[PDB]
Design a protein around this ligand. Structure first.
Ligand SMILES: CSC[C@H]1O[C@@H](n2cnc3c(N)ncnc32)[C@H](O)[C@@H]1O
Ligand SMILES: CSC[C@H]1O[C@@H](n2cnc3c(N)ncnc32)[C@H](O)[C@@H]1O
Ligand SMILES: CSC[C@H]1O[C@@H](n2cnc3c(N)ncnc32)[C@H](O)[C@@H]1O
Ligand SMILES: CSC[C@H]1O[C@@H](n2cnc3c(N)ncnc32)[C@H](O)[C@@H]1O
Ligand SMILES: CSC[C@H]1O[C@@H](n2cnc3c(N)ncnc32)[C@H](O)[C@@H]1O
Ligand SMILES: CSC[C@H]1O[C@@H](n2cnc3c(N)ncnc32)[C@H](O)[C@@H]1O
Lengths: 231, 226, 231, 226, 231, 231
């Protein structure tokens, strides 16, 4: 039985939208029909409701690979199998402006720790999202005429260890943004058989945001994410 | 400036009791005189008040190395420099009963990620707490006649990977418990110049409550305010 | 000046279809209009011609990451910037039959050697193909009603070091097939700014082909690849 | 059975002269008595004939470790067990002139890929050629009054990565040349029980022809048929 | 059956004071009652005698992890289970002066050989001394009014590969000194179940001595060490 | 300025015969003309004298890579540039008998510490002896009708971590024996420009001896070694 997410079985939907910040989970729940808080233990708020004719949940995953791994595992134990992460990111290329969106196609990461414990060796396993789901997401964002970019991101483990060199290094490796939990999400999903994808809102540009404008972009895009999730 | 812990100048004390669970931070704040909630952004609760007429703070660090690193870095930017983690752990030896305490003397860990980004290579830097502060914790606990054990712990990055062969491997390596953030706390502290220590409440035994948390929080607070 | 591919400048098209076997390069050239052999040095046959209203080349890359890296680099030096690899692969899942196709979405690999020399450290850089190009490929194969599967593959460096354990290990890591040069192609392309993708013909199933049936599938699919390349 | 080198039973000799370039294999076959093309699949040309009235084969191995591993594995399945690589190399020291030869005594390499799959871990296994065969090569070359050098080489996996700092790093480590397949040849041979050696023609000097290849092929063939 | 230290069982005490220099072993045996030379094979001098109504041995461990690992293993086979390392060290910080002492709380080290062979993987096992025994040492040194510092050290494997960058790197990682065998002593003791500790005499300061001044400090603190060993 | 070997410059010869056991150094000095003890510090005995109208030193290097690295560095500072290791080894193959000799052609080793500190990365540098000098040894042993084998050895860092799996693993990797310092000697000699070689006496056979039989073999081949050193 899950020791972090204390929701009753059946209280978590098969389709889940995961966000790092609890407050955003609460804000996004207002987009659902008849939202109910199904868990608040350890600050990991989970809301379940309806969108279209489908049941869906919005869960908090906290910060970092170890945190999201725990939440995903327990949500799966509760019946979840489809996850779409909706978070913030720091752009690594100058042509992407704050507030715009990034649909992730892959995640780069430094090996070790979590990956070693799960994979049992240092192999560079392809950390990619579900192909179908990611395309559906692209379509959804395209229909709502939202400004987005398709590309790989680097999943950092040390937020406060990202100097200037850091930018040229990862941008030169085909990464257009940095975040912290996509690598874990994709790799764990591939191993567990879960279908996952991710959309990010550019909160800052490292090659060059207000809490209000963030929410404005968040809301405008969450609509595309929910349509996708329930498509 | 801090983008997660949105506290004002002078709202975070120099000495901080850090816990992973927001609920425990709240619960523990009731032991302080006139506790004030100085932050709730992203769910990371931080309280500040007095104990033994001394200013202190109790903060939430979430789960895992990446999370606690960010929290410690921001708390330090707001003025903190002494950290004592008070969490839960899974015993790796059969002779430790639930509800008892473990005063941590070191942390084993798997190389990679966070450590590589901070250390710039894969050397195994000694992950240890402040010598003096740890001895004070030992003193505070024994004075309170509490049942504690002193030993190293393994700081895991994958709670749900910790398999079968797990217990034997880590206990045969000198570790008596498993937790997830002591290695990050100790190493980052040694590197940034912070004084850190850790005491854990045994919540489960892999080889085989609130009363316990409350019972020892006093000893912890006594040490932080000495 | 390239020391392996001795084609004259302008003799290599911007769009290139790369195959491992020289014989297949020769066989596929019959699909082009007015094919001309532009290089035969070191056995790396390169043919250039037209398909639709676009100029396009078919090049031999040999076997392995080190070989394809050299060929791609020299072809790029000669003006190439778009590559689609069309090769054979060993399926890792029982539900994929010989002769069917696999459109690769990512490549897993063991770190070291080539990746270390190019990346300068052990970081697990996302080894993914161009998102747009790969979707175009999917569409092309769909229109011609070809049986294909979308997924990640493992790029092995040791053909004769792939035991039974090997299968369960990589199939459990989200890989549906094993090949030898996709990881190199994708990662080098991401670093150099080239647009690449890959389609494979299942030649064998490790969870369970004649030279004739191979060519039959090859031909039937190369038509979808060329349309994509010149789309 | 071999899926790349499609030769019949008894068409591949026990002793094989291996080269990366198909064109050189063809060229060298003219030095044999009644050479027959026993394979051309995937472009890997293999000839078999006599030299000094002795049966031998000249085979193409392509470029890089992964390619030569496959070729050696299949040649061995067809009966080969003695391999002498004859290729080109880039000198790492300024005192070696183009057209001269290097008899290889060992191969440095970066861990990973191919070696990990075969060795099952990242230990640095000594990558060396057969002691006896290498001394015979030395003897054959000196008898032919040819200018050769004896030393280790670095087997690179990325021809176009070999940067600036490159030359200084590898030459300061005891290597006098750079090539791409000696490490795979030597290690796999030690592991599979094959007798291998390597002689290289200097095609370029990073620190600063067919006549040369032909001139030394004789010494190589003399050694393979002794 | 030990092949390096040819001492007969019963001739090695449960408590052992280990030093790298055979000459220091002889000098220190002078502080014991009725010292007997129990082994001289391969130069590893071992003396056994009494101190404060307790049997104690002083053993030579040579230089480096491989050397000390062998000596500890063999002494343990002969009955030893408590070891206190008394060596010399190079200070990594400016404020520690020559002749002063360092009581070790942990040892950093570069991954590799010895550790990999014993631990069987590259995990960073906490290389720390026995808590009780170490606090005992601290108490003994205070009771003797000796100037000591308490901190971590870096156990180097290459004495002549300790340049300028070196000092800044390791001191910034929380180590106050450099020596060569503590990490091996601590880690092996944790695996084998032995109780170990270490106190070092500062012989040089890499941030900023004669063997005469050394022996004075060595002897000056030798009593504190032996008191701790027999306490 | 050496701090371990206190020999004065001019007292160490350009050619040095190195052994791990101080006792063997003394025994072998018996074969020199007018041997003089040039150093005894830290137990590292060094003798200097003549043999075949040539000055030669016999030096003790202790056990392990760290130990020998220190001794070689210091001897080199005092003028040495040619070293021949004469140690003992455990055979990994059945056909080599106790008392017979092995002339080393290369040394395998586990990555880590010492190598990382000197080389500055984990590259597998070819750890081989000087070609000319090694062929010289082979010739000397043949001229003396001594039974020898020529092959690679594995330089282990943990003597007591050599189990059953161990023997099969290393012998299958082409090594015929195990010892502890050849890889360090060869690699360091390549970096520093010294000319080194090694010949070992089989003292045990891990696949399937008294110090009396040992010394006989040691002395029996000592002349071959010294002849080579002064040839
Ligand atoms: C700024 S709050 C950090 C959180 O948002 C994402 N993030 C946004 N910007 C960045 C950045 N510049 N570096 C790393 N993570 C970032 C991460 O996934 C983490 O959970
Ligand atoms: C039980 S909630 C898990 C949290 O408590 C600690 N913990 C308690 N028991 C364990 C265990 N068995 N394994 C890993 N972490 C544990 C971790 O540091 C994490 O923040
Ligand atoms: C069978 S010929 C090997 C070539 O075809 C691909 N291949 C096909 N089947 C396999 C397999 N089972 N393992 C590895 N590579 C394979 C590789 O990319 C290599 O260039
Ligand atoms: C010049 S063609 C490259 C081929 O010859 C060898 N070679 C020649 N010169 C070099 C060089 N400078 N760097 C790497 N390999 C080289 C390689 O093993 C490869 O098969
Ligand atoms: C100079 S004495 C060398 C011995 O003392 C310790 N030591 C003293 N100073 C240093 C130093 N600067 N670097 C490394 N080890 C040192 C080591 O453990 C070694 O056995
Ligand atoms: C038993 S003598 C140990 C010494 O001789 C060599 N040696 C002899 N036998 C072995 C063995 N079985 N394993 C490792 N080293 C050995 C080592 O280099 C060490 O300095």
């Amino acid at each position: 039985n899950p020791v972090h997410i204390l929701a009753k079985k059946g209280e978590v939907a098969e389709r889940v939208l995961v966000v790092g910040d609890p407050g955003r989970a609460r804000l996004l729940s207002t987009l659902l029909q008849n939202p109910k808080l199904t868990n608040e233990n350890r600050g990991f708020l989970v809301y379940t409701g309806k969108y279209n004719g489908e049941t869906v949940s919005i869960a908090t995953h906290g910060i970092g690979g170890p945190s999201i791994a725990i939440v995903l595992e327990e949500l799966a134990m509760l019946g979840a199998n489809v996850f779409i992460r909706y978070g913030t990111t720091g752009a690594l290329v100058p042509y992407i402006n704050l507030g715009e969106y990034i649909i992730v196609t892959g995640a780069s990461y430094n090996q070790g720790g979590l990956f070693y414990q799960y994979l049992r060796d240092n192999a560079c396993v392809a950390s990619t999202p579900d192909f179908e789901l990611t395309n559906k997401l692209v379509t959804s964002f395209s229909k709502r005429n939202l400004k987005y970019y398709v590309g790989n991101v680097f999943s950092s483990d040390a937020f406060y260890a990202e100097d200037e060199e850091f930018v040229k290094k990862w941008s030169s490796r085909g990464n257009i943004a940095v975040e912290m939990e996509c690598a874990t999400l994709f790799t764990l999903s591939k191993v567990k058989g879960w279908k996952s994808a991710t959309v990010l809102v550019v909160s800052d540009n490292l090659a060059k945001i207000t809490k209000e404008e963030l929410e404005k972009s968040v809301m405008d895009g969450a609509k595309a994410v929910l349509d996708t999730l329930t498509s």
